Amino acid sequence: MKTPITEAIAAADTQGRFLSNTELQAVDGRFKRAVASMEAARALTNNAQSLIDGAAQAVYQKFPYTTTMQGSQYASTPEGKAKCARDIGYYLRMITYCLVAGGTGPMDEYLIAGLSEINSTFDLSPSWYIEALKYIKANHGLTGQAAVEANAYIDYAINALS
């Protein structure tokens, strides 16, 4: 999985050599940044439910047709609404993983790989998720570097969706 640490050893490994000061400074770089990352992860996790419930509504508000239109890809049914909230929880949960790990690794393996295929096969619209992510971005309530860390991964998700 892609983290500042695995990236550091992979580099040394391909060149078939021992770790050097070059790689070590990178790991200390992540170690020092962990403080702000952990703070973000903690806050997102403690407020998971309200952010998820808020984000879902933001989506339904912006794209009202996803609640009335008929089809299994929409949330016009209690089942569709459960799947929808579930998917949102998946996104939120993945960005906290990225904060704890210090890299995009978790999101890349678990969510980005195969994304476009899935959204294509089940007629799911990207803008639906981009909307939910923007809501989480504007309301996580974090400040300082904790916000920069959180936003870094939210925006990363936004780009994968566009």
Partner: protein, 172 residues
């Protein structure tokens, strides 16, 4: 490969749950001991050559039959291979110390090694002695109180000992 951090993430996901305060607290502690881990790696790595060379000299003084004609380390080609193998074992052990997880050591170094020596006709148990040796030197150099801020590194040293024992057990 995984580092101690991704290891927790992978376990959290398979269950489909967020991290718990226990986990946050546990991972937050790894970050606190970071400095000790950077020093361990720097020192061992900084004495790579000495560790391998001194350990091999001892191995050969203890088991002279490995270098007698016909021995598995006889001829410069087999000897270079032997030294290379030691440096490689040491290299992957330092990766595990940086990562805080033995995955990289297991997937990219230890698996298939036993089969490889069996097929080559290399005394796997003799390799174990070689690595046991580097272990002692490595740790001796890692927690030498001279040249650095005092404090306890005992837990890290015991972890470092683990990866070494782990490799030794994989060939013996």
């Amino acid at each position: 490969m995984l580092d101690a951090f991704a290891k927790v993430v992978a376990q959290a996901d398979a269950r489909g749950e967020f991290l718990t305060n226990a986990q946050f607290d546990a991972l937050s502690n790894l970050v606190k001991e970071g400095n000790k881990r950077l020093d361990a790696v720097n020192r061992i790595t900084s004495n790579a050559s000495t560790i391998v060379a001194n350990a091999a000299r001892a191995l050969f003084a203890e088991q002279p039959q490995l270098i007698q004609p016909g021995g598995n380390a006889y001829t410069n080609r087999r000897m270079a291979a032997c030294l290379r193998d030691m440096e490689i074992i040491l290299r992957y052990v330092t990766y595990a110390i940086l990562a805080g997880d033995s995955s990289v050591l297991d997937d990219r170094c230890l698996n298939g090694l036993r089969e490889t020596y069996q097929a080559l006709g290399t005394p796997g148990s003799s390799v174990a002695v070689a690595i046991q040796k580097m272990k002692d030197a490595a740790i001796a150099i890692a927690n030498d109180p001279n040249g650095i801020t005092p404090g306890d590194c005992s837990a890290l040293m015991s972890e470092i000992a683990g990866y070494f024992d782990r490799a030794a057990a994989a060939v013996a």
